[PDB]
Design a protein around this ligand. Structure first.
Ligand SMILES: *[C@@H]1O[C@H](CO)[C@@H](O[C@@H]2O[C@H](CO)[C@@H](O)[C@H](O)[C@H]2NC(C)=O)[C@H](O)[C@H]1NC(C)=O
Ligand SMILES: *[C@@H]1O[C@H](CO)[C@@H](O[C@@H]2O[C@H](CO)[C@@H](O)[C@H](O)[C@H]2NC(C)=O)[C@H](O)[C@H]1NC(C)=O
Ligand SMILES: *[C@@H]1O[C@H](CO)[C@@H](O)[C@H](O)[C@H]1NC(C)=O
Ligand SMILES: *[C@@H]1O[C@H](CO)[C@@H](O)[C@H](O)[C@H]1NC(C)=O
Ligand SMILES: *[C@@H]1O[C@H](CO)[C@@H](O)[C@H](O)[C@H]1NC(C)=O
Ligand SMILES: *[C@@H]1O[C@H](CO)[C@@H](O)[C@H](O)[C@H]1NC(C)=O
Lengths: 72, 72, 136, 136
């Protein structure tokens, strides 16, 4: 969106991959500087933290993104 | 002997509650208030509250320092 | 020499400031439509910001209008470049380093006219810096 | 007949809208100074409000500018009368009942440009009406 000038609510999760190829077929040499991520679940669920990190760097990070943070 | 040090770490995170911006929610500023602290930006802020503001950890088991008053 | 030309260079391009506006992230619902009347209010807000900077820093009274803010390259994602000239002298482009200081003074005032806050109205070369968090 | 004249009647007086601004009650401290640049932003905000009303109600595109908003009787307490004319026709004063409908549509937008809220920026003939309190 910051590289191809598209509306806001344009190119959501349902239409990521088809809008990847609509841009590179529209104009080449502007897709080559784009840095994308290969992030996917079963890689975010699969960290091997154990022993003290499951309460001090994993559980307390998910508490800050809840509604009432200093009560949970 | 060592399970009374884990409870020592647990009640340190209990004293640092009772404030709405939790101390493990955002990075501190360094000296000139223009950028973050360097290892809070490369790592996570929560990962920064454990190793530098709770433990003040060293790089090895050979290098040890003072008694670290708050923990005491 | 170089035979040929590139259709990207422009005589006003090195003094332009790119503005990028994301309306449906700062508001989502209850978000207004960006027609030509909203571009009029933006050009009068930049002309307000240039008037205050020349009065409170340089002690000059220069009557910038909304016709001195020249907007190019309008896109759907709400993007344009702009540059500010003298009020009745089209040859006299204000340099970019003084338009950046004028917007930095009144960025809190331009943001409130459009209900955006510093991340949905970004100026691409002007970043927010200030604010020390000394709570306790 | 009546021999003599009164120095209060004016040919633009029955189509004027009095604006009263109380800056040090909505802000108190952190309150800006009201110089001639703030009067420029007010005249461009009213000209923005007239542009949106003629587009979204009457489907006309009339390019009101800040020179079509004529401000008289400026006082220290921040008070003035204003009236809006046609863009290049000084004889064509917009009637007061349509300027009142134009400000009523965009009163939430004019208020946000000056950090006032509906009681420190009053228009003296335009009162806020809406809002039912159905909480439970
Ligand atoms: C409009 O602005 C330009 C500058 O952008 C003025 O041009 C200057 O003119 C003086 C004398 O005429 C020269 O000494 C300068 O070198 C010129 N500036 C540049 C950048 O070349 C021009 O005079 C202005 N016009 C008016 C009517 O004031
Ligand atoms: C400026 O506005 C006035 C109205 O305020 C216009 O005057 C009208 O002119 C037509 C024909 O010329 C008459 O039939 C109307 O009776 C006039 N109106 C009034 C209120 O007397 C005038 O034409 C406008 N000028 C321009 C150039 O459009
Ligand atoms: C994204 O843009 C395309 C291009 O016009 C449009 O057809 C589509 O409706 C847009 N998507 C959304 C969610 O607005
Ligand atoms: C656009 O880039 C992607 C990513 O490498 C590539 O797979 C695709 O083939 C490119 N499109 C064209 C038309 O080459
Ligand atoms: C950062 O702070 C140091 C002093 O701690 C100062 O010398 C330096 O100029 C500052 N950097 C910036 C960009 O302000
Ligand atoms: C521990 O913290 C103190 C300040 O509280 C600091 O001076 C010292 O360098 C820290 N220890 C290490 C190993 O960085």
């Amino acid at each position: 969106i910051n590289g191809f000038d598209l509306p806001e609510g344009n190119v959501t999760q349902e239409n990521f991959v088809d809008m990847q190829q609509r841009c590179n077929a529209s104009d080449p040499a502007a897709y080559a500087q784009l840095v994308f991520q290969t992030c996917d679940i079963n890689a975010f669920l699969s960290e091997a933290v154990e022993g003290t990190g499951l309460a001090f760097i994993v559980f307390t990070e998910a508490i800050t993104k809840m509604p009432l943070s200093p009560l949970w | 002997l060592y399970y009374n040090t884990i409870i020592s770490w647990i009640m340190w995170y209990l004293f640092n509650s009772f404030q709405e911006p939790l101390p493990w929610s955002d990075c501190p500023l360094n000296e000139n208030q223009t950028g973050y602290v360097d290892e809070c930006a490369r790592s996570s802020p929560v990962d920064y509250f454990w190793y530098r503001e709770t433990l003040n950890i060293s790089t090895s088991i050979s290098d040890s320092g003072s008694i670290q008053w708050w923990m005491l | 020499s170089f035979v040929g030309w590139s259709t990207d260079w422009s005589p006003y391009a090195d003094q332009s400031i790119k503005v990028r506006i994301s309306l449906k992230s700062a508001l989502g619902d209850k978000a207004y439509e960006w027609n030509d009347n909203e571009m009029y209010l933006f050009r009068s807000s930049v002309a307000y910001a240039m008037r205050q900077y020349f009065l409170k820093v340089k002690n000059q009274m220069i009557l910038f209008g909304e016709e001195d803010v020249r907007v190019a390259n309008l896109k759907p994602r709400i993007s344009f470049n702009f540059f500010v000239t003298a009020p009745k002298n089209v040859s006299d482009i204000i340099p970019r380093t003084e338009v950046e200081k004028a917007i930095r003074m009144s960025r809190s005032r331009i943001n409130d006219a459009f209900r955006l806050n510093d991340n949905s109205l970004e100026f691409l070369g002007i970043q927010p810096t200030l604010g020390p968090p000394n709570q306790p």
